[PDB]
Design a protein around this ligand. Structure first.
Ligand SMILES: NC(=O)c1ccc[n+]([C@@H]2O[C@H](COP(=O)([O-])OP(=O)(O)OC[C@H]3O[C@@H](n4cnc5c(N)ncnc54)[C@H](OP(=O)(O)O)[C@@H]3O)[C@@H](O)[C@H]2O)c1
Ligand SMILES: O=C(O)COc1cc(Cl)ccc1C(=O)NCc1ccc(Br)cc1F
Ligand SMILES: [Br-]
Length: 310
């Protein structure tokens, strides 16, 4: 089902993630997702696969499998486009690739701006990211323009910490509040403080990496594994569900949106089968208890940026 955003639109609480979905597999992944019921796709220019996502979206619209109004397509402004005069063209490139004339939601992908150019991570000779002097507030004003030009129906933020959310909410002359803050969230990083702050302000939180991103490129064999945690397996077994299904249902019952990624057709379908069972309150609190402040999405080359959020 769907959650009401502070722009008046409804957002499906379950979406399909596309980071790391290979370009030769993601068109079929998104076709399968729409065929089995998904109506929300999470995209980003930096994922380098929006053309191939778009081929799937467009084919399903052409085939009349779904209407555009029924889809909720999200993408994100990359860090090298935080500049007033680059935001619109970045949005338009994403629209072109996705074969759309609007996005349902467009996010500032990270609070940090980087030097524009070809490189997504421009580095100095010593390996530090090179910042942009543009502030989160001027980037937000540029996002607000996209609403007013009809390119996007909603704007939001991603990886913004408490203080950064507050900065936006306190922006002089704020025209549109952020509708969403998309952040990493799973039983090893439960985010209770940031979620309660955002929800108290009427901002909907989307949980990314809800399975722990086991395919993240910097994974190590020794790292914690949610999918293999026997405690979570035990809750799944009790409910006759998979561990992944429990990990997807968990954020749903916290009033979060969740965006698990898969390119495996059988898992795409399995991951959607989460509307026919309920975790108990005790199950929810037990899952919350596994927090270890273990963050899979972080990056050393960006840790000296003034706006690095963590
Ligand atoms: N805003 C941002 O900064 C940000 C950062 C990270 C992620 N995200 C968004 O969040 C989405 C989800 O996060 P994520 O991609 O990091 O990881 P994730 O969804 O936590 O995990 C994806 C991994 O789980 C596997 N998997 C999926 N379903 C499974 C199932 N039922 N059983 C066993 N394994 C399963 C997938 O394998 P297969 O694909 O091989 O099936 C893939 O290796 C991303 O794709 C992206 O859209 C946003
Ligand atoms: O950022 C994401 O959505 C997922 O992670 C990545 C995806 C791609 Cl395609 C490339 C690189 C990352 C990646 O490294 N993301 C981490 C990241 C990025 C920027 C900043 Br300011 C901080 C930070 F921790
Ligand atoms: Br950042």
């Amino acid at each position: 089902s769907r959650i009401l955003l502070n722009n008046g639109a409804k957002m499906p609480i379950l979406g399909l993630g596309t980071w790391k979905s290979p370009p030769g597999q993601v068109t079929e992944a998104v076709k399968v997702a729409i065929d089995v019921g998904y109506r929300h796709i999470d995209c980003a220019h930096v994922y380098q696969n929006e053309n191939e996502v778009g081929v799937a979206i467009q084919e399903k619209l052409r085939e009349q499998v779904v209407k555009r109004e029924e889809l909720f397509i999200v993408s994100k402004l990359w860090c090298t486009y935080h500049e007033k005069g680059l935001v619109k063209g970045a949005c338009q490139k994403t629209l072109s690739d996705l074969k759309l004339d609007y996005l349902d939601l467009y996010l500032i992908h990270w609070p940090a701006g980087f030097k524009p150019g070809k490189e997504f991570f421009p580095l100095d000779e010593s390996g530090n990211v090179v910042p942009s002097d543009t502030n989160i507030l001027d980037t937000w004003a540029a996002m607000e323009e996209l609403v007013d030009e009809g390119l996007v129906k909603a704007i939001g933020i991603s990886n913004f910490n408490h203080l950064q959310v507050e900065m936006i909410l306190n922006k002089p002359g704020l025209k549109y509040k952020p509708a969403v803050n998309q952040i990493e969230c799973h039983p090893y990083l439960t985010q209770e403080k940031l979620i309660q702050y955002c929800q108290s302000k009427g901002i909907v939180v989307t949980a990314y990496s809800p399975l722990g991103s086991p395919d993240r490129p910097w994974a190590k064999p020794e790292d914690p594994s949610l999918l293999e945690d026997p405690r979570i397996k035990a809750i799944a077994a009790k409910h006759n569900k998979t561990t992944a299904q429990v990990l997807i249902r968990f954020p749903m019952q916290r009033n979060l949106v969740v965006i698990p990624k898969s390119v495996t057709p059988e898992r795409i379908a399995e991951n959607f089968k989460v509307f026919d069972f309920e975790l108990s309150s005790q199950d929810m609190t037990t899952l919350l208890s596994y927090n270890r402040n273990w963050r899979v999405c972080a990056l050393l080359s960006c840790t000296s940026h003034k706006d690095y959020p963590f």
